[PDB]
Amino acid sequence: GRGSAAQRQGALAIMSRVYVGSIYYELGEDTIRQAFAPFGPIKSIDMSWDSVTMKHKGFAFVEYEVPEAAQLALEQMNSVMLGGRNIKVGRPSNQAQPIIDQLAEEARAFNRIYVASVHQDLSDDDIKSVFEAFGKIKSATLARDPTTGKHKGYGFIEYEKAQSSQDAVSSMNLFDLGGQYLRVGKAVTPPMPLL
Amino acid sequence: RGSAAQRQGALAIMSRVYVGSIYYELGEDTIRQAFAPFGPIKSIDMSWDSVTMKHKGFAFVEYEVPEAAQLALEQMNSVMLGGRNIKVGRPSNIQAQPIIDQLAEEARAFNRIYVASVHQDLSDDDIKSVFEAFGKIKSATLARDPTTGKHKGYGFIEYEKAQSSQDAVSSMNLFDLGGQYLRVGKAVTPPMPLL
Ligand SMILES: [Cl-]
């Protein structure tokens, strides 16, 4: 095999964060959150800060709950204009690369796609019906709050065939469902990566 | 929307991408090699600080067509060059935005895709045959040097149906053909934009 459970977890953590730069001085955490939340609920944000000037240094690190959200944010939020500036989005610059590469390779063995911006009223069966228009589905599951049981606005769908997942991503990314636009992309990690 | 002069000014802006966070040791040659897969580089405007006799860490790469800049923006952002994750964005200058928006809207009326990194040995009919696997094609044309008649490694393909063009982009971007990987994407301008 490759990567101790501990190594894999460290990689997953790094893969869940995106660097955001060129942030207008007047913009704060709440603006960033609003702009990046469509890709998955924000776990936390580490904003730069200067004690002498009493302001952030123009950049921040947004952390998501899963790697897939960071991947979509990276592909869709770069150069978007915020506060009059084109923000920059990238992967953290900080030995984890080989593990990250291994996870990406392992993910290709599944026809799994990540779906974000899922309206609160949609259920697992609702998402499944819609997405099975692209092909037979092995499983469709929305992530849920461990306490409430309410889904967190995102989930994963596994198809029996690769062509089905490819078609789904191409047709459903930015699809307007329930008033919001879904953010869809191929998985970048296998399911249960630390197993 | 916009006269011929306004549209051409927009097309010019749309053909350039900002490249930032360039390692001090890297020069024009490295940038060109890294960005050429999306279309042949027309020119590069590199920042310059003579006092220290070094560039300022950023440059503007100009392509022959807007589609190449679009692909470069979607595929080169955060790529690691010289140990640094480069940043790619649209020029911050631009009153041209409304015209750019108009061109994007007009482009959606055609099922046109841009194909870059086309090996020199491929011909128009070669490209057509390959791509017609996705659907009936109205035209497949590689851009050619006005003097030699040799294609410049890129072209445009128009499909009769939108689903065909969508399938082609999804299936052919990064497709290994003739030793290189094709760079494919939807057109961002209508054909003959200033007509
Ligand atoms: Cl080949």
Author numbering:
A (entry chain B): 114 to 207, 210 to 310
B (entry chain A): 115 to 208, 210 to 310
Paper text:
Herein is reported a 1.95 Å crystal structure of the two RRMs of PUF60 (PUF60 RRMs) in complex with a sequence from the adenovirus major late promoter (AdML) pre-mRNA 3’ splice site region (AdML3’). The structure reveals a homo-dimeric organization, where each participating PUF60 monomer captures a nucleic acid tract, and the PUF60 dimer places two nucleic acid tracts in antiparallel directionalities. Second, each monomer only binds to a short tract of nucleic acid using only the RRM1 but not the RRM2. Furthermore, the first position uracil bound to subunit A accepts a hydrogen bond from Lys-201 of subunit B, as discussed in the next section. RRM1 residues surrounding the uridine are shown in Fig 5, where Tyr-132 is the most outstanding feature that provides stacking for the uracil base. Therefore, UG is found bound to one subunit and UU bound to the other. Therefore, the bases of the wild-type sequence bound to the protein were assigned as U17-G18 on one side of the dimer, and UU from the polypyrimidine tract (PPT) on the other. Therefore, the looping in the wt dAdML3’ is deduced to occur between U17-G18 and the PPT. The Lys-201 side-chain from subunit B contacts U17 of dAdML3’, which is bound on the other side of the dimeric interface. This lysine donates a hydrogen bond to the 4-carbonyl oxygen of U17. The structure of dimeric PUF60 RRMs in complex with the AdML pre-mRNA 3’ ss region sequence suggests that PUF60 may also structure the pre-mRNA, albeit using a “looping” mechanism instead of “bending” as used by U2AF65.
